[PDB]
């Protein structure tokens, strides 16, 4: 067609008026020459933006193919016409269309070093892994042609996507070629963020061996450990912790990994976070603790566990207010750690008289035994806390309780030179003749430790 021929050349020559006159005269907007080039092809190749937009407004096929599989987007990517690339994509151009050789627009922008075009193509979903007929990726071409900044950009985008998808072999080869293991997307997520979010234990391990920053923050302050505590990946939480992950990292909302674990019902992850130093008392902007979030979400099994851990620590530490506030929240007064120590055990050992009274006032077991038979009175007699010894005895403490070795409170008081406690125990019915499993009486122990005055008292009482 002569009209079509006139239109093709009018578009190739940048004659904006001629194009409009010819379209008004019925010229086929999608005419093709001997090799399949349409007016939109030629306008994109020659960089005539106005015509590109006119042809599209008149029904030009944005993805028209020449005989070799080139689209208008291929040609704009080749010639470096950023604005035409942007307009073509707006109108539905195939960002990943491949020619007969498997070449995509991203290959061409990387091959010829069009940085801004590479960035726009990636933003529009360009496939960084696309290989042409010869197995070349856009990165390979960038490197082959010495476009080193674009090559690193392609490595970064690839590593972020490979990490998210769990493609170990890809991740390894990307870092072998110099991929930045600590790159980030627009949100601030690093490859480690994405592997932990998606639950790829193998990738997390490989990333960390290659120097991944375990405490990378995103825009909102989220750490990889935050994400693993959110998603519930126990082993990943463990691996992150072993590699220096911060147990109490905080985000803009004030939430720590323990907040996330407790909110999303990850009991095992709460236990691991506690065992690794998680702060049960931390608070977020809304003014809530990990315990508060667990109770609201119906996880009493987690709420109680947080109360248990907090009570033992606060009882040991001597923090009376926390104890009283934890009792008001329903903390188990008789909870025990792995050794069997209750809050009362730990308050007596440390000499925290006030706390002893509170715990007893709230139903604490005055004769609770640890795994070895030590009662709270045993520990008070050991450390020499006269007031605590008297409070315990007043509350029904067993003055002659024997541990697994047959040791009684009087043995310990005599062995460690607490005369005033000896007299108190004797006054409360302590058995001066009790022998431990080695045949030792309190008298005998006082002698072995050079406590003359106590030995004299114990002898007369016999």
Residue numbers in the entry: 12 to 473
Provide the authors' own sentences about this structure as they appear in the paper.
In this paper, we present a strategy to fuse specific, high-affinity protein binders to obtain multivalent or multispecific scaffolds of predetermined geometry.
D12_H06_D12_H06_D12 crystallized in space group C2 and was refined at 2.3 Å resolution. To accommodate the capping repeats packing against the central DARPin, the inter-domain angle in this DDD construct widens from 120° in the model to 140° in the experimental structure. Considering the elongated shape of the DDD molecules, which amplifies the effect of small deviations in the connector, they agree remarkably well with the designs.
